[PDB]
Amino acid sequence: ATIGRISTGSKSLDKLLGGGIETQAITEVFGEFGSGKTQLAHTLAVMVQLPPEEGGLNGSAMYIDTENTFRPERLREIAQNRGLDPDEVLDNVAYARAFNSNHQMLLVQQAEDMIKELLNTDRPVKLLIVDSLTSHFRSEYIGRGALAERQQKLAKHLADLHRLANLYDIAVFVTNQVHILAHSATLRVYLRKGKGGKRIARLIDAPHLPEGEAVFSITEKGIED
Ligand SMILES: O=C(O)c1ccc2cc[nH]c2c1
Ligand SMILES: [Ca+2]
Ligand code: NA
Ligand code: NA
């Protein structure tokens, strides 16, 4: 099935990504607080709702929040400044707070129910966000021998997410805080602050995509060049 692409709002970042964030894939962005990872998540939650000639998939979004990073008024602002109705856009983002890593897993199962429900409607789910995906796992699995268990649990969680992406043709977008641990996202993107208030993006361990870095801004429209 054809891979769909969601624009990030930034022409530069979209180019680095080969056109945007892909369905049937997990894209992981990681970086320090304020690197743009959460701003990008919010922007994508709006962009996915647009028609394809505007960089979206005529879809809705789901947002799993682990560290209280979700800001409804930020979504409304991004929407308003892109010519969209802020309340309608907010209503197309299904929010859930994950209380711990086990609840986080249950939420992914519940997400499947909604995805199935909307799959053949005029606005299917096309984006599932997990912000700070590892935070609960790092808090809960800690100490001697915790590495193996934590990595196994994360691998299973990521396998569940890969299944949703592939089975239902959705983009999964996950964020993490910032070197020898394994990772199983399809594509990993490192974000960092640059000069002039810009953020800089670099693909990590992606020999299949061309060499370069993207530059973008955080504005009233979310993310743009
Ligand atoms: O409202 C819901 O049914 C629901 C279930 C799971 C998730 C995961 C992110 N948002 C959700 C909403
Ligand atoms: Ca951010
Ligand atoms: Na895939
Ligand atoms: Na709606």
UniProtKB/Swiss-Prot annotation:
The gene is radA. GO terms for biological process: DNA recombination; DNA repair. One of its GO terms (molecular function) is ATP hydrolysis activity. It comes from Pyrococcus furiosus (strain ATCC 43587 / DSM 3638 / JCM 8422 / Vc1). The keyword Metal-binding does not apply. ATP binds at G31, E32, F33, G34, S35, G36, K37, T38. Belongs to the eukaryotic RecA-like protein family. The keyword Oxidoreductase does not apply. Involved in DNA repair and in homologous recombination. Binds and assemble on single-stranded DNA to form a nucleoprotein filament. Hydrolyzes ATP in a ssDNA-dependent manner and promotes DNA strand exchange between homologous DNA molecules. This is DNA repair and recombination protein RadA.
